[PDB]
A and B are shown apart, each in its own frame.
With several copies, the nearest count.
Chain A
Amino acid sequence: GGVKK
Chain B
Amino acid sequence: MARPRPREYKAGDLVFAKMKGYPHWPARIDELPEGAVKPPANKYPIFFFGTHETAFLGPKDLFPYKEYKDKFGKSNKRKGFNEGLWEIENNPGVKFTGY
Residues in A lying within 8 Å of B, measured CB to CB: 1-5
Contact = CB atoms under 8 A, between A and B. Distances in A.
Interface string B55-69: 100000000000000
Interface residues of B, number: 8
A4 B80 CA distance: 13
Interface centre among A1, A2, A3, A4 (most CB of B within 10 A): A4
Contacts, number: 19
A3 to B, nearest CB: 5
Contacts of B51: 1, 4
B54 to A, nearest CB: 5
Nearest to B51: A1
Interface centre among B46, B48, B54 (most CB of A within 10 A): B54
Given A2-B54, A3-B53, A4-B55, 9 more contacts: A1-B48, A1-B51, A1-B53, A2-B53, A3-B54, A3-B55, A4-B51, A5-B19, A5-B55
Interface string B22-40: 0000000000000000000
